[PDB]
Write a protein that binds this ligand. Sequence first.
Ligand SMILES: [Cl-]
Ligand code: NA
Length: 334
Amino acid sequence: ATVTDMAGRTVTIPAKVERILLGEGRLFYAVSLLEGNKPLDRIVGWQGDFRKLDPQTYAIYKAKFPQIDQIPLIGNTSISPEKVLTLNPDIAIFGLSGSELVKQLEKAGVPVVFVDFRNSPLKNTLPSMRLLGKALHREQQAENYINFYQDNVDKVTDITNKIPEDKKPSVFIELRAGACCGTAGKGNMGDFIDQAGGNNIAKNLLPGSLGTVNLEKVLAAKPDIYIASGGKSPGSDAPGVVLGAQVTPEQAQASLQKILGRKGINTLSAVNTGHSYAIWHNYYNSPYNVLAIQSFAKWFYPEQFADLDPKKTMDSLYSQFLAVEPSGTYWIEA
Ligand SMILES: [Cl-]
Ligand code: NA
């Protein structure tokens, strides 16, 4: 009847939950692990980020669940309402930031539950999933995913927790690489570099999980490994790495060569020797991020993780927890 969410708030959990509001649409990723073969049946409204900013994954779901388009889009605009109480929701899910709708929902006695996959994903990913298991009456499903997640993160931290600091390769990840050089320090994808045995150039070169750092000159740190994140669609014309549910290995590869073609970056040692990589950006706010930890690791220590196939982890994730087929490309090499 009560949970403590990742904001420390105490929240009563109604006995019946069938109408879920998503205050950030891409919280569908977390919900989708709990919902089995009926991923949309309980979403009565979401903020539009998932439909508009991950159109590739959305389209995969549309092809199988056409009713996805009628799920109302919460916003002020394109958006379909912004007075959610008329959806009579049982519960609402938000991510921690790093607001007004939340206070209004409290007044009406709607339980608002805060999760977090973005600020401190190492600390918060599994507590957020167990929290959602409790608040949405999917405890066994949450625990199932937690064991799958823990077992697949163990496959990595079993090896990289015993690696000396001098052997750790230096790593710079460029977030949203196309706008230079925004990154993550103590947190967000920094956690994934930490878990995967790497040394993040910006690990304390900024006091926070997300931020932007000085341009590519500070990449005279000669990182052993280069990593760019993006989730643009093919033919987008808008600059950025091209990854997602509808991207081919070749289409991903052509976008990475071009991002590695920019000035300065094409002088880095990791670029001209084949140590450059691209990762799906939505791993930065999603409990699927285990796939990015495993991808980082296999890149950082190839010989030591040569038995570890992240595509096989992903196939097993979809097989066990999701209603759609794995498609597209979410990481790529150079
Ligand atoms: Cl974003
Ligand atoms: Na999905």
